[PDB]
């Protein structure tokens, strides 16, 4: 379908999704000096992503703005929620609970990726609309 040669949204969503994947694969074996940076790395990707979307919004039809902004709302929400779990898992380092809190991080990050993927979907539908798809 759509040409992604210079689709910034699509790159930024890819790179945020890769970031979640990276963190996930790495998380279990990993102490806080390793797993905090990777969450930073997600957040940074996220912001790069929302900034791009802010620039794109005004190019896309009026009728789709609400829905997007909400998808953006959500992503922040998710990130927040991932940090919470991140902090919990740090409180309980080298204790019985370490691992079961890393589980709830993984759940949170998988949410983030899913929702970023959904954001991308919205954008596309917007472009397609604006590009005059049938």
């Amino acid at each position: 379908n759509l040409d992604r040669s210079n689709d910034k949204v699509y790159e930024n969503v890819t790179g945020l999704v890769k970031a979640v994947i990276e963190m996930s694969s790495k998380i279990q074996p990993a102490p806080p000096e390793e797993y905090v940076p990777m969450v930073k790395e997600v957040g940074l990707a996220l912001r790069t992503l929302l900034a791009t979307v802010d620039e794109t919004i005004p190019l896309l039809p009026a009728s789709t703005h609400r829905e997007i902004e909400m998808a953006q709302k959500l992503l922040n929400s998710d990130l927040g929620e991932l940090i919470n779990k991140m902090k919990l898992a740090q409180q309980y380092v080298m204790t019985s609970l370490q691992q079961e809190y890393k589980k709830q991080m993984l759940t949170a990050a998988h949410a983030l990726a899913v929702d970023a993927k959904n954001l991308l979907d919205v954008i596309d539908q917007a472009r397609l609309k604006m590009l005059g798809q049938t």
Partner: peptide, 11 residues
């Protein structure tokens, strides 16, 4: 889990 996002990763 892993396998789920890894597909949507490259569509």
């Amino acid at each position: 889990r892993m396998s789920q996002i890894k597909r949507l990763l490259s569509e």
